[PDB]
Amino acid sequence: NSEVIKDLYEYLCNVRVHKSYEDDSGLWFDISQGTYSIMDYKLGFVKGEVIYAPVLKQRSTEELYSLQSKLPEYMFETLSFPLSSLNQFYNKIAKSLN
Amino acid sequence: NSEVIKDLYEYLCNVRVHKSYSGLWFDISQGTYSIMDYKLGFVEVIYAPVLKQRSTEELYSLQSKLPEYMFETLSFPLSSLNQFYNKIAKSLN
Known part of the structure; x- marks a missing residue:
């Protein structure tokens, strides 16, 4: 049933989450x-x-x-930030892709 | 694990699917x-x-910051579901 909920978020939010893993x-x-x-x-x-x-x-x-003409340069770099800004981030990305 | 994903989508997209039917x-x-x-x-x-x-x-x-249709029940193609979510997201501020 998780499969169907993924599908929803993709059309609703244009995001897909593929795999999960704890490493390191x-x-x-x-x-x-x-x-x-x-x-x-x-x-x-x-x-x-x-x-x-x-x-x-x-x-x-x-x-x-x-x-390059849509995303800020730092989007091509590796970064770090708290959860409070995860939606900010997601938004920044979504807006960039128009 | 499939619940940690629900949580990710929640923080990430500011929208939670409580249950599927x-x-x-x-x-x-x-x-x-x-x-x-x-x-x-x-x-x-x-x-x-x-x-x-x-x-x-x-x-x-x-009703102050939301387009009228948001309160009516309506239909539209999957094709524009995201453009819809954005309106909602960008309306609640």
């Missing part, structure tokens, strides 16, 4: 966010916070240049 | 009172407002 000491999520503008990334939880890691290897050259 | 129906509350409770049924999408529990004061706060 951190809960990591493979996230996919789109609208054909798609930004892949991982969210890792090692609260002491959230660690954002862009996944650009599925991205073609054109798509990268396209995202 | 002739046709897939879902309980949904959106917001961080300025919170919208509604249901979505998939037959084409069907949007069902849920004012069943709000105070007249809440009904008033919401």
Whole structure:
């Protein structure tokens, strides 16, 4: 039944969560966010916070240049931030993809 | 594990599907009172407002910053479901 709820969030929020895993000491999520503008990334939880890691290897050259004109530069970098700002972040991304 | 995902989506998208239910129906509350409770049924999408529990004061706060149709029950293609969520999200402020 979880499968169906994923499907809902994808159409409702344009986000998909694929896999879950604790490695090192951190809960990591493979996230996919789109609208054909798609930004892949991982969210890792090692609260002491959230660690954002862009996944650009599925991205073609054109798509990268396209995202560059939409996403802030720091979206292509690895970062860290608290949960209070996770929706801020998600929004920032969603808005960027128009 | 499938519940940690529910939580992720909650923080991430500021919307929780309380429960899943002739046709897939879902309980949904959106917001961080300025919170919208509604249901979505998939037959084409069907949007069902849920004012069943709000105070007249809440009904008033919401009706202040929300497009009218948000209070009527309506239908539209899946294709524009997200553009819909954005309106709601960006309306509750």
